Amino acid sequence: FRYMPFSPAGTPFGFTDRRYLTMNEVGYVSTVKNSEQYSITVSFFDVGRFREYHFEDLFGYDLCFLNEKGTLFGQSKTGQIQYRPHDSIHSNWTKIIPLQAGERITSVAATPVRVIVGTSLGYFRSFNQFGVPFAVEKTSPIVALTAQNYRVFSVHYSQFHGLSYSLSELGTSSKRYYKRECPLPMSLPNINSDMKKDANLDYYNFNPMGIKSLFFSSYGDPCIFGSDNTLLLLSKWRSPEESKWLPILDSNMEIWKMSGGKETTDIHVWPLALAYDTLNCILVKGKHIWPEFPLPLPSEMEIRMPVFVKSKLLEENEIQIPVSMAAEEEYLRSKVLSELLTDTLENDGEMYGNENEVLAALNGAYDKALLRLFASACSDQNVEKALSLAHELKQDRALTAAVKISERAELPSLVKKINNIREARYEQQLK
Amino acid sequence: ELLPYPHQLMKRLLNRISMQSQLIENISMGFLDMQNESKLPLLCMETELERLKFVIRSYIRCR
Amino acid sequence: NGLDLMSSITFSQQDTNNLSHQEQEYLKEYCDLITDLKSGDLVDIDLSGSLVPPSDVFIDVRVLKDAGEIQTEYGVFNLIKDSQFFVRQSDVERLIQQGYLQKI
Amino acid sequence: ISQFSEAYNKILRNSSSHSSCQLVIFVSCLNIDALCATKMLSLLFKKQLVQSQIVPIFGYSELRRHYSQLDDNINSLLLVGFGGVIDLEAFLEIDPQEQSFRRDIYVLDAHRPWNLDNIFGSQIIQCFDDGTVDDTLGEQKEAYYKLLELNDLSKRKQRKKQIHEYEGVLEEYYSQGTTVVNSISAQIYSLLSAIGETNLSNLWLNILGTTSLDIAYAQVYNRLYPLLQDEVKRLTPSSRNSVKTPDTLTLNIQPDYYLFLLRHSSLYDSFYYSNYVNAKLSLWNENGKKRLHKMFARMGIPLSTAQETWLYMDHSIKRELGIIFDKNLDRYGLQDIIRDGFVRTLGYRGSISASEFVEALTALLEVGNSAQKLTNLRKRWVSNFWLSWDALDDRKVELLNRGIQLAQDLQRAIFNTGVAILEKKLIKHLRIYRLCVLQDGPDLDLYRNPLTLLRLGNWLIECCAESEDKQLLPMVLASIDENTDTYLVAGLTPRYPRGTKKPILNNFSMAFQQITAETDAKVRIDNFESSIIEIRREDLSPFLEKLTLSGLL
Amino acid sequence: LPAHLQQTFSPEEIQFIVENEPIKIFPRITWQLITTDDKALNNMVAMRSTEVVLWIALLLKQQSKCSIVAPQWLTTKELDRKIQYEKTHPDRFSELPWNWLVLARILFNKAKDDFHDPIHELRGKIQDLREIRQIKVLKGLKYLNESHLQLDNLSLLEINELRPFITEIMDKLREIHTASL
């Protein structure tokens, strides 16, 4: 199985002689080939802070990774790498990584204190910001890399194995592992016989794994977005035996609801950045799923839990969702977000300074959405289902509101059951 | 025809337009003495007062 | 009503500047009255011009047909002949109505 | 010594206040490239939100009456190309006041002779010294460096001769002719790329100034044939045509000709300046007024479909000239016609290249309007300069064609008298040069403003651009319109028929120092460019007698 | 004492009452705003919405350190459904953004080169809708009764343009109706 050079959010050439090297929340890096060489132009979204520049390439650097401090270039054939800092304090440096026959650089990464270079045979060579070489480590072949200023996240895959994930940190004294080669059940792309004449064949040839984009969240949670169009977020990463992947977004249901129940395929989702509530994307309209020259304006898309029926939405009728049906989806969305925000503040603390107002508003909407399902259970005379819903309340003021819904529904036995929960929580609080 | 001149609210903010003119009066001068950076917070404050000052300029002339 | 050398209401229609000279004392009794309406405001609000609303804060302005040194207040702008500016908004309002600067 | 990013940030913090901390720039109007460099600098200062003040100065003697009299707290003066030759610090006294000084100018000089004090011994003159010349007279590390500090009867005697050895290398230097080696378009556009601002308007702007020097030198822009190519490909907006977009300003390349302004119009008045091209061959009127009638009146040139035939289906005929001159290539071999060139479009409103575009800017700068007449003459050229600077918007359309229809009569005006002074036969090769004095003809008014005079010479240097295998020396002309015989006399450069190997810049400015140093009997060098001076009527005849013997080439 | 344009507004201040309405942005930057109607924030976070007033954001776009999101009805796939509810209803105009015409003209000066393919489509999809409104307005005024009208959905601009004549015709005919008795 021949490998391919992978980059974050990279697009292939297609039917043109120009393409994008990389793309992220900082900006985008594109190249223009005019019959003999490549012209790399790096443009940013924030014109005020940094200045747009360009240069001529004489080596053909196709591998790139962009962070807040510099730009790293790499060559998959000769093994020559180059790091270019944006500020004028540090000078440029050039070093050539020795590569054997067959072995090629598939993915590169750059942090401000460590340099990560990965190969097709799985050699892990790490360098610092000054160029001092460290110990050489031999592991599984790396096909995908992502980082946000401190850690190394590697994805492994071979011909006699399957997709996995590893989480490590390059400390000052030694390498410490949070997660060591745990299996990742991400679905592989199913190329059929009719795809050989399709116009989207060029995207899968440059990226056989189907990994469109992958990045870390604003609060430190690992995220991945494969070819199955489902956004996966890693929950409970501080505990290796308790780590779980939770799907909180799906593009396949959002396109059908916004288009009025149609079956078109000209609308897609390209992930750029996600800071706990909205995935930034570009609405690409056309046959190709990859962007080209000039980028449209970014839109906002809030996350939604993929829990719907298809036959029930047609009978009840932009497609609109009723009150009663949306209470189940609001309960699932708020429960996942409140648990992750609580563990982040008790272990890492504040990051922006306004986390307490977000947590108070999220916990208030969590108890309010549960009361809508609680009112529906009392109307259908199901006293037993209403008892289990009362135990999921967090705030003490939510238990008082549950009594008033029960008295209005003429259920005196349900009223006394709420008071037993109140006496049990006060006893545990005094221990 | 003419309407009752709501004098009560007018003098209430007529104190305010004196104050923020004096607020930016010192804090620019504090920025000159500290200049041996950000040019945002001056320019917005300068334009915001005069636009409200523009409104009452028309409002008393039509009287 | 007074923006730059007000009482020079001369160089202005001499064949009728004796006509309205009987009306000048009527005219200046507007002008005297318009002064105390400028001062009798308890705060400093302009009543001399600036009727069009402002839009932006940076306006390219050119000059012609004028010379000398003017604008002793709000920083001297050092007006030389036929030389454009690029300034903020509120300064030129007392000069465009004066008729020294020409084009916005 | 001045890294390009450093001076920008340094000049940022020095005047960025919202008061009268006004930095002011100066520019000459006597040069086209001097304009276009400044225009792009202003607009980035707009979007970096700083207050400014722009003043033109047309005269070198005027500089005292525009700076040295009106200053209050200007810390940041800026200037475009004025003092490569004469030292301004000797021209204007500035005493050292308040090592970390209180007011610092820059300079953006574009000329070949430099001034050693302005780079070495820099305390207020922060010049643009970055990777422009790495060999800034590299032998100077001991000449002035031992001139600064200057039994010993035999030792100091040798030491005075070493100073005299240093004296000669400062005597042959500061005695060279001048050009512009590198355009001011090249520097500031490279500076902005170090900052990295992507706008095709900039890429449309910077190529204008280097296009202006296509008629003054040859191999300066021959170095820039790659630097035009890479940028239009690296700043590729699109791979497709993506048609019917009224915006987006698409950039391409198309071939083009010395026969000029064709895409704007007139294959009719091409007939004159086709004979200009045959004035580059062997004639001015005679054979061509037969010879043109094999290649031209082949098609009668219409009235309505000539809006379409010499706009559109002249592409069948540009191809046809393209398949005429390929068989005029191994046989004629005259390669002043086929050229690579550059073009732009606006989505609509016709295709306008940059070859003809510099032509409209020259003529529109010209027309478009004791010692009491020169003041009312000098107030004109500043004013009509001003209506050309705003020509770089889309907002000027029906004034853009005004210069266009102005240009195609001015050449018809200038050729009307050039054919006269030929047939008068008043060019006399005396010994060194040729002298011509236009004592009086018709229409003398269009020779006060000197920008027409270099073009008249540009036509006149090419009448003598035959073989001429001895005496390749340009001319000196003479004309007078106004009182007291002002006589804006000027010199030209010799030319090469596309074969510069010999270092031919100028010899006259060396002699212009000599005659000005003799008697000061009403001679003037108040005009800016050293290639133009003035003379009195009774002094031009002893001028040449001083010049026919003083062989300084 | 203007004495020039008194009975109506000039077209330079009708934009002045609409610029003081807030919309949403995408911020980029990190005291800041004490402008008596401020809501200054801290180090502001990108990839998020915020109700910000308009005129400061236009000034924030000239220094170019933020970006704008268009309002939710500014796609071409949305305006088409407006043109069908009116073409079946010649009685009146159906559904109105209420300040749409002055909103686009501000939005076409470095607020157009941000959005995803609006040229040769959006000015197509607006200038048609201007006249369809004013074709509707020509049939309405022919049906003029005495002292009672029905204008339900009009932009502010046509209100500044129907204004200075619609008064004095019905006012001058108010005399001959009333002074007859």
Note whether A361 and A219 are same-domain residues. no
From the list D85, D140, D78, D141, the residue with the least C-alpha distance to D111 is D85
Eight-class DSSP state of A43: E
Rounded-to-integer distance, Cα D482 and Cα D536, Å: 12
Establish, for the pair of chains B and E, how many residue pairs have beta carbons separated by less than 8 Å. Answer: 23
Number of domains present in the structure of chain A: 2
Q: How many residues does chain B have?
A: 63
- DSSP assignment string, D283-328: -SSTTHHHHHHHHSTTS---SSTHHHHTTTTTHHHHHHHHTTTTTT
Contacting residues for E74 by C-beta, under 8 A, at least 6 apart: E107, E115, E122
Is residue B53 within 8 A of residue C81, CB to CB? The reply is no
Clarify whether residues D420 and D273 are in a common domain.
no
Give the SS3 label for residue A361: helix
Instruction: Dig out the tokens for E94 from the structure.
Output: 């159906």
Which chain A residues have a beta carbon less than 8 Å from that of E67? 45, 297-298
Structure tokens given for C37: 């309406």
| E50 to chain A: closest CA residue | A300
As a whole number of angstroms, the distance between CA A180 and CA A169 comes to 11
Give the residue from A165, A285, A141, A175 showing the smallest Cα distance to A214: A165
Helices of type H across C40-92: none
Shared-domain flag, residues D79 and D196? yes
CB atoms closer than 10 angstroms to residue B10: 12
User: Residues B47, C35: contact at Cβ < 8 Å?
Assistant: no
Strands, sheet with E51-53, edge to edge from the N-terminal-most edge strand: E51-53, E22-27, E66-68
Residue pair A329/A49 in contact (Cβ under 8 Å)? The answer is no
As a whole number of Å, the end-to-end CA separation of chain E is 38
Domain count, chain D: 3
Q: Per the CB < 8 Å rule, is B61 touching E2? A: yes
Residues A313 and A264 in one domain: no
Instruction: Assess contact for D130 and D3: CB atoms under 8 A.
Output: yes
In order of A196, D85, D465, D475, D511, the CA distances from D508 in angstroms are 75, 14, 21, 11, 5
> Nearest CB to C53: which of B14, B18, B54?
B54
Residue D323 and residue D376 in one domain:
no
Given an 8 Å threshold on Cβ–Cβ distance, is E35 in contact with B23?
no
As given in the structure block, the two tokens for residue D104 are 């610092």
* Cβ count near A164 (within 10 Å): 19
Who contacts D450 (Cβ-Cβ below 8 Å, separation ≥6)?
Answer: D30, D488, D490, D527, D529, D532
Distance in angstroms (rounded) separating the CA atoms of residues D166 and D154: 19
Helix (H) or strand (E) holding D513: helix D508-516
Using alpha carbons, list the distances in angstroms from residue E93 to E87, E99, E128, E140, E166: 9, 14, 14, 11, 20
Q: Which position has the token pair 């440096």?
A: A93
Resolution reached, in Å?
Answer: 7.0
A352–E115 C-beta distance less than 8 A: no
Distance from CA of C47 to the nearest CA of B (A): 7
Q: At A119, which helix (H) or strand (E)?
A: strand A114-119
**What's the rounded Cα separation, in Å, for the pair D419 and E107?**
58
CA–CA separation, D476 and D437 (whole Å): 8
Cα–Cα dist E41/A363, whole Å: 23
Give the whole-angstrom CA distance, residue B59 versus residue D171. Answer: 76
D20 closest CA partner among B34, C76, C85, C101 = C76
Amino acid at A151: R
Cβ-defined contact of B57 to C47 (cutoff 8 Å): yes
With H, G, I as helix, E, B as strand and everything else as coil, classify residue E180. Answer: coil
End-of-domain residue from the set D219, D237, D255: D237
- Neighbouring CB atoms inside 10 A of B19's CB total 12
Whole-angstrom distance, CA of residue D484 vs CA of residue D47: 50
| Nearest alpha carbon to residue A308 among A295, A331, A326, A323 | A326
Question: Nearest-5° angle of CA A292, CA D237, CA D318?
Answer: 130
| 3-state class (DSSP) for residue D331 | coil
Closest CA to A224 of A185, A168, A178, A267: A185
Return d(Cα A393, Cα A383) in angstroms, integer.
17
β-bridge pairing D125-127 and D105-107: parallel
| Pairing relationship of beta strands D343-346 and D251-252 according to DSSP bridges | antiparallel
Calculate the alpha carbon distances from D261 to D42, D214, D249, D257, D354 in Å: 30, 15, 20, 9, 10
CB contact under 8 Å between D70 and C85, yes or no, is no
- Asked if the C-beta of E138 comes within 8 angstroms of chain B's C-beta atoms, the answer is no
C-alpha span between E56 and C57 (Å, rounded) = 11
Run of H or E including A342: helix A323-345
HSE (side-chain half, CA atoms, 13 Å) at A291? 26
Tokens read off for A371: 């009361």
Name the 3-class secondary structure at E95. Answer: coil
Contact of D206 with D40, CB cutoff 8 Å? yes
Structure tokens, D230: 């890479």
Distance set, CA A113 to CA A130, A171, A179, D246 (Å): 9, 10, 21, 49
CA angle D3/D6/D7 to nearest 5° reads: 95
Contact A44, A64 (CB under 8 A): no
Of all helices (H) and strands (E), which one includes residue A114?
A: strand A114-119
How many angstroms separate the CA atoms of A332 and A320, rounded?
A: 19
CB atoms within 10 A of CB A285: 14
Strands A175-183 and A213-216 come out as unpaired
User: In what helix (H) or strand (E) does residue A65 lie, and over which residues does it extend?
Assistant: strand A63-66
Distance CA A247, CA A305 (A): 8
Q: Which two tokens stand for residue D453?
A: 């005079």
Task: Answer with the one of A278, A307, A336 that is the final residue of a domain.
Answer: A307
- Residue D412 shares a structural domain with residue D534: yes
- For residue E71, what are the CA distances in angstroms to A178, A257, A320, E52, E94? 44, 19, 20, 13, 19
Query: Which residue, of D306, D334, D362, is where some domain finishes?
Result: D334
Decide if C42 and B14 are in contact by the 8 Å CB cutoff: yes
Q: Cα–Cα distances in Å, from A314 out to A304, A307, A330, E180?
A: 19, 15, 21, 64
Specify the DSSP class assigned to residue B51: H
Name the nearest CA neighbour of E18 among D327, C53, A379.
Answer: C53
β-sheet with A278-281: strand ranges across:
A273-274, A278-281, A299-302
Domain that holds residue D370: 353-553
Q: CA nearest D467: which of D273, D258, D289, D280?
A: D280
Q: Are B57 and B36 in contact (CB under 8 A)?
A: no
Q: Which residues numbered 6-35 in C keep a CB inside 8 Å of some CB on D?
A: none
Beta-strand pair A299-302/C59-63? unpaired
Mutation site for E-interface testing, chosen from C37, C52, C55 by largest number of E Cβ within 10 Å: C55
The coordinates were experimentally obtained by: cryo-EM
* First-residue to last-residue Cα distance in chain C: 23
> Which one-letter amino acid corresponds to residue D340?
D
D136 touches chain C (CB under 8 A): no
How many residues in total does chain E contain?
181
A80-85 vs A70-74, strand pairing mode: antiparallel
- Give the Cα separation of C24 and C6 in Å (integer): 13
Contact yes or no for D110/D84 (Cβ under 8 A): yes
Same domain, D232 and D275: no
Are residues A312 and A270 both part of a single domain?
no
D 51-90: CB under 8 A from C:
51-56, 66, 70, 72
On whether any CB of chain D is under 8 Å from the CB of B32, the answer is yes
Q: Determine the residue of chain E that is closest to C52 in CA distance.
A: E12
What residue numbers bound the domain in which A114 lies?
1-307
φ and ψ of E25, to 5 deg: -130, 175
Cα separations (Å) of A160 from A140, A141, D520?
12, 12, 97
D90 and D138 within one domain: yes
D55 vs C83: CB contact, 8 Å cut-off?
Answer: yes
Q: Which residue of D has its CA nearest to C77?
A: D20
Is D255 among the domain residues?
A: no
Residues A290 and A383 in one domain: no
Residue in D460, D412, D414, D463 with CA at minimum distance from that of residue D441: D414
DSSP assignment string, E125-162 = HHHHHHHHHHHHHHHHHHT--SS-----S--HHHHHHH
DSSP states of D237-258: --SS---S-SSS--EE---B-S
Domain match, D326 and D405 both: no
**List of chains touching C (3+ CB pairs within 8 A):** B, D, E
Q: Which of D51, D379, D383 faces C87 most closely, judged by CB atoms? A: D51
Nearest alpha-carbon partner for D271 in D387, D119, D412, D174: D412
Per-residue H/E/C for D142-187: CCHHHHCCCCHHHHHHHHHHHHHHHHHHHHHCCCCCCCECCCHHHH
In contact, D342 and C42? CB cutoff 8 Å: no
| Residues in chain D, total | 553
Strand partners, A278: A302
